Structure formats: structure tokens, C-alpha cells
């Protein structure tokens, strides 16, 4: 391909309870990241055979 | 209103798809990072957004 | 070469005669058929290295 992906995520929180009490729940959330490649970088040189032979 | 019966409507529907898929990858870059927020690229995003509205109007959405 | 050849020829005719008459004589005819090849048919496809790598 020409692109890649990376995931992202949130965190949680702490709580406490005494006897007889229930437990709560929390919702986490997501996202993503994308990158792309478009351009090429180069260098080039040229020589002649007559100069190469001498 | 949108229609899907004939070749005339098929062309407009096809144009909408590739008009929106050009906008799709720019909005993600607009928010995920600060790398590509130069004023020269928001201009390209603006032209693509402008073309999308014309495509919608032509398709009759 | 770029040519081929085939030969063609004609047939004869029947006639009638009575005593004292000379016999007529008929000449057969010839021709030829030639066929040539001049045109080449092809299909071509090209790709770029930058697109190949991704």
C-alpha cells in the first residue's frame, strides 16, 4: 500500500464501595491515525565512455 | 430527488462517489495532527469542498 | 519473402466439322494470384516503478 494506520484509546477511573453496594461501569472511546507517502527523492550523475576509458 | 434507473442517473451517481472520496482523506488530516495545516493546503481542501457541493446539486440530492 | 503465388488456367471448347473443312484450334489462357502481408497487430501496456512499489 502507500499508507499505514495506528489506533488510539482512552483510559479509566477508580472508585470504591462499601458492603451492599453495586458496581458501576464506564465507556471507553476510540480513534485512529493515518499517514501517506507521495514523493520520491533521488540523485543522479552521468559519464561518457570515451572519458571513462581514459 | 435521487434516482437510480438509467445511464443518465448512473453518471451523476458515479461522479458523486469520487467527488466525496477526494474530500474524505483531508478532514482526517485536518484533525489528527498539526503536520499538514499550512495555509496552502487548506486552500486545496476548500476547492475540493466547493466541488463536492456542485456534485451534490448536479445529482439532485 | 512477403508474397505467395498460385496459378490459374482455362478449359477448352467442342466444335463440329463436315468433310472438307479445316480443324479450328483454340488457345488456353493463364493468370496468377498473389497475396501480401504488410500490417502488424499488437497490444501494449506500461506501468511506473513508483506505483509498482505500492
**Helix, strand, or coil (residue B32):** helix
Give the number of other Cβ atoms within 10 Å of residue B55's Cβ: 19
> How far apart are alpha carbons A23 and A12 in whole angstroms?
14
Could you give the CA distance from residue A32 to residue A9 in angstroms, rounded to a whole number?
A: 9
Query: Chains C vs B: touching, with 3+ CB pairs under 8 Å?
Result: no
- Distance between CA atoms of C27 and C15, rounded to whole angstroms? 14
| B23 half-sphere exposure, CB direction, 13 A CA radius | 14
**Phi and psi torsions of C5, nearest 5°:** -135, 145
Check: CB of residue C11 under 8 Å from CB of residue C28: yes
Contact at 8 Å (CB) between A8 and A32? yes
Which of B29, B32, B35 best probes binding to A when mutated, by most A CB atoms within 10 angstroms? B32
The HSE-up count of residue C38 (CA atoms within 13 Å, CB side) is 2
List all residues 6 or more positions away from C12 whose beta carbon is below 8 Å from its beta carbon: C26, C28
Q: Do residues A9 and A37 lie in contact, with contact meaning Cβ atoms separated by under 8 Å?
A: no
What is the rounded CA–CA span in Å between residue B34 and residue A16?
40
Q: How far is C51 from chain A (nearest CA, A)?
A: 9
**Cα separation, C17 vs C15, whole angstroms:** 7
Question: Resolution to 1 decimal, in Å?
Answer: 3.0
Residue of C nearest to A39 (CA): C50
Quick one: closest CA in B to A31, which residue?
A: B32
* Pairing mode of beta strands C3-9, A3-9: unpaired
Instruction: Assess contact for C3 and C36: CB atoms under 8 A.
Output: yes
Under DSSP, the state recorded for A3 is E
Expressed in angstroms, the distance from the first to the final Cα of chain C is: 48
Residue at grid coordinates 484533525: B31
Check: CB of residue B10 under 8 Å from CB of residue B59. Answer: no
Amino acid at each position: 500500500s502507500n499508507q499505514a494506520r495506528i489506533d488510539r484509546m482512552n483510559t479509566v477511573t477508580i472508585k470504591g464501595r462499601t458492603p451492599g453496594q453495586k458496581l458501576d461501569r464506564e465507556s471507553v472511546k476510540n480513534d485512529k491515525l493515518v499517514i501517506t507517502v507521495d514523493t520520491v527523492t533521488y540523485a543522479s550523475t552521468v559519464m561518457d565512455w570515451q572519458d571513462d576509458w581514459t | 430527488a435521487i434516482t437510480t434507473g438509467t445511464t443518465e442517473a448512473q453518471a451523476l451517481n458515479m461522479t458523486m462517489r469520487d467527488a466525496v472520496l477526494k474530500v474524505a482523506p483531508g478532514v482526517q488530516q485536518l484533525v489528527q495532527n498539526s503536520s499538514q495545516l499550512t495555509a496552502a493546503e487548506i486552500a486545496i481542501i476548500q476547492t475540493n469542498i466547493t466541488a463536492l457541493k456542485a456534485a451534490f446539486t448536479a445529482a439532485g440530492a
